[PDB]
Ligand binder design. Structure first.
Ligand SMILES: Nc1nc2c(ncn2[C@H]2C[C@H](O)[C@@H](COP(=O)(O)OP(=O)(O)OP(=O)(O)O)O2)c(=O)[nH]1
Ligand SMILES: [Ca+2]
Ligand SMILES: [Ca+2]
Length: 278
C-alpha cells in the first residue's frame, strides 16, 4: 500500500509531484493537473500527491514522479541495472552502497534498478553519472531533475533517513561544454555517424568521421579524440598500439594532413565543410 510507506508520507508534504509517460526509453514528466508536459524547474507545473494520483488516473499515465529542488532536503540516488531476473542485487558496488547508505530504497520501473532517497547533501567533488564495465551505472542528483516513484520497497527500506553522503566518493568517480557544442553542431549539419552495420568497412567509416572531425574541431587532435570516444564508431581498436602509436592517433593525424579547410567558431564558415552530410 503506497500511502502507508513512511517515505511516501514524507514526500507527500511537498507539492512537487508529477506523472510520467513512457516515450521510447525516456520517461517524460507531465503536469498532473492539465495533462501537458511539465518543466522540471517551474514549481507550478507540479502538484501535490493527491493531484498527481488523480492525474495518473485521469490521463492514464505510467506512474508518479517527484521533482527534486535545491531547497528540499532530498537526494536522489539512482542505481541502473543492478538487479538480476529475481530482483536481487547482482553488482557488488551496489550491494556495498546499500550496506553503507541505509535509507528508503525502491525498485525502479524497469525492474532491474534501484532508487535510494536520502535527506542530505551531495559531496562537491563527485561526478553526477558513473558508468561501470558491466553496464550498471550510478547517477546522483539533488535538484534540477525529477525521479519516478514506484513504491516497490526493496528489502523493507521504507523510511527516508538523514545521512552524510561523503561516502558516495567510494562509488562515484571524482571530478578533478564546448565539446558538446561541437557534437550537437555536427548532428544538426548531418555530420554525425550512426553505428556500423554488418557489411560496413568500419575503419573506412573511422576515416570519414575523422576527416569531418578535423574540420569541425579545427584540427584540435585532443578535442577530436575526446569526441570520437563518444561516437557510435568507438571500439577497442582505437587504442591498440600501431607502429609508433595507436590506431586512433594515426587516424586523427592522417585526417589533419588531408583536410584543408577548418571551421572557425568566430566566423561560422559552415559552408566551407568539404564533406556532404550523411
Ligand atoms: N526531464 C526528463 N527526466 C527524465 C527523462 N527520463 C528519465 N527521467 C528521470 C526520471 C527517472 O526516474 C530518472 C532516472 O532515469 P532512468 O533512465 O534511470 O529511469 P528510472 O530510474 O526511473 O527507471 P529505470 O532505470 O528504467 O528502471 O530520470 C526524460 O526523458 N526527461
Ligand atoms: Ca534508473
Ligand atoms: Ca534536494
Amino acid at each position: 500500500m503506497i500511502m502507508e510507506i513512511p517515505a511516501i508520507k514524507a514526500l507527500s508534504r511537498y507539492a512537487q509531484w508529477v506523472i510520467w509517460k513512457k516515450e521510447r526509453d525516456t520517461k517524460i514528466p507531465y503536469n498532473p493537473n492539465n495533462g501537458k508536459k511539465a518543466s522540471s524547474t517551474d514549481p507550478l507545473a507540479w502538484g501535490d500527491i493527491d493531484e498527481a494520483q488523480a492525474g495518473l488516473v485521469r490521463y492514464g499515465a505510467n506512474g508518479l514522479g517527484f521533482v527534486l529542488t535545491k531547497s528540499d532536503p532530498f537526494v536522489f540516488i539512482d542505481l541502473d541495472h543492478v538487479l538480476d531476473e529475481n530482483k536481487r542485487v547482482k553488482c557488488e558496488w551496489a550491494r556495498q552502497l546499500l550496506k553503507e547508505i541505509k535509507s528508503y530504497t525502491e525498485i525502479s520501473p524497469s525492474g532491474d534498478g534501484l532508487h535510494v532517497v536520502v535527506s542530505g547533501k551531495l559531496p562537491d567533488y563527485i561526478k553526477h553519472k558513473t558508468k561501470f564495465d558491466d553496464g550498471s551505472a550510478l547517477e546522483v542528483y539533488e535538484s534540477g531533475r525529477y525521479m519516478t516513484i514506484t513504491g516497490e520497497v526493496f528489502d523493507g527500506r521504507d523510511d527516508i533517513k538523514e545521512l552524510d553522503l561523503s561516502i558516495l566518493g567510494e562509488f562515484a568517480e571524482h571530478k578533478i561544454l564546448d565539446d558538446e557544442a561541437i557534437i550537437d553542431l555536427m548532428k544538426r549539419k548531418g555530420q554525425w555517424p550512426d553505428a556500423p552495420k554488418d557489411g560496413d568497412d568500419w575503419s573506412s567509416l573511422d576515416m570519414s568521421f575523422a576527416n569531418r572531425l578535423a574540420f569541425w574541431c579545427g584540427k584540435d587532435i585532443e578535442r577530436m579524440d575526446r569526441i570520437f570516444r563518444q561516437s557510435p564508431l568507438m571500439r577497442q581498436k582505437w587504442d591498440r598500439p600501431t607502429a609508433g602509436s595507436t590506431y586512433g592517433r594515426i587516424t586523427l593525424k592522417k585526417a589533419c594532413d588531408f583536410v584543408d579547410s577548418v571551421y572557425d567558431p568566430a566566423l561560422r564558415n559552415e559552408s566551407d565543410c568539404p564533406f556532404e552530410p550523411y
